[PDB]
Design a binder for this molecule. Structure first.
Ligand SMILES: CCS(=O)(=O)c1ccc(CC(=O)Nc2nc(-c3cccc(Cl)c3)c(C(=O)c3ccccc3Cl)s2)cc1
Ligand code: NA
Lengths: 250, 12
């Protein structure tokens, strides 16, 4: 079905590197140079106050929409990944449900500016005080701290591509029917990532990467905060949250 | 249901 479901040679691992990096370039949502160029474009004190004054439900809806757009690009990335379309429908769903948010959380470090602790949101950079209307300050501060720690690694685009392919192709997700097929694909993606790091003298990042439990905790925290919001505004979720967001998080 | 997810995966 796919070469990467079996033992792969060095040449085939070198191709996997190129393939993953290409899949990522084509599905990235925003170019790194565009995000970097816009760093000087920061929300004014008046603009921040305006975001803080929005109703809780309006802020949640805007954030659920922006998240859904980012996730859509992660779905496209998954589809372009060697071997993903060869897995059964159950497993593709299992992988995307558990990993799509994790991939978005990793991709977000490109949009995070560690110099002033701001993130690119709705056309400009803003600090964590911009999301105060959500009423989930601990979750927001935990997300900014994660983006801050990832930023300290100075990831290249190729590294993010290879590391996110691995965040998604995780053979330990409960509910996988073809676990051994996913284990082999994960092994080959692990080799591709570690090969690229070896080749670029970047193996020192391996020890600095966050533990898998960190990404799981951030995703569980998001689902917990959504459940609190859902109990307060059930009609808002039902009527105005994107259907893809609800399939993944509700 | 996973209606949207199924649709996204089957759209070539
Ligand atoms: C992700 C791919 S890309 O780097 O190309 C790209 C694309 C679009 C944007 C704009 C955007 O959509 N910007 C957002 N920034 C945040 C946010 C909120 C809190 C902390 C942090 Cl660091 C970011 C958002 C959330 O809604 C959000 C996200 C993750 C987790 C919880 C929330 Cl609430 S949307 C940024 C980056
Ligand atoms: Na960054």
């Amino acid at each position: 079905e796919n070469l990467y479901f079996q033992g792969a040679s060095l040449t085939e691992i070198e191709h996997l590197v190129q393939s993953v990096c290409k899949s990522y370039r084509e599905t990235c949502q925003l170019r790194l140079e565009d995000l970097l160029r816009q760093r000087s474009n920061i929300f004014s004190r008046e603009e921040v106050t305006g975001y803080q004054r929005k109703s809780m439900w309006e802020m949640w809806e805007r954030c659920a929409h922006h998240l859904t757009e980012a996730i859509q690009y992660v779905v496209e990335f998954a589809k372009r990944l060697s071997g993903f379309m060869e897995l059964c429908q159950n497993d593709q769903i299992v992988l995307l449900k558990a990993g799509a948010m994790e991939v978005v959380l990793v991709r977000m470090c490109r949009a995070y500016n560690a110099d002033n602790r701001t993130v690119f949101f709705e056309g400009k950079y803003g600090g964590m005080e911009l999301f105060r209307a959500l009423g989930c300050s601990e979750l927001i501060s935990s997300i900014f701290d994660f983006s801050h720690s990832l930023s300290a690694l100075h990831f290249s685009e190729d590294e993010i591509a290879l590391y996110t392919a691995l965040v998604l192709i995780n053979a330990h997700r409960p509910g996988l029917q073809e676990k051994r097929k996913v284990e082999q694909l994960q092994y080959n993606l692990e080799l591709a990532f570690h090969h690229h790091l070896c080749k670029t003298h970047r193996q020192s990042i391996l020890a600095k990467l966050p533990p898998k439990g960190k990404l799981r905790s951030l995703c569980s925290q998001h689902v917990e905060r959504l459940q609190i919001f859902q109990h307060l505004h059930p009609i808002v979720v039902q009527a105005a949250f994107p259907p893809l967001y609800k399939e993944l998080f509700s | 249901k996973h209606k949207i997810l199924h649709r996204l995966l089957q759209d070539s």
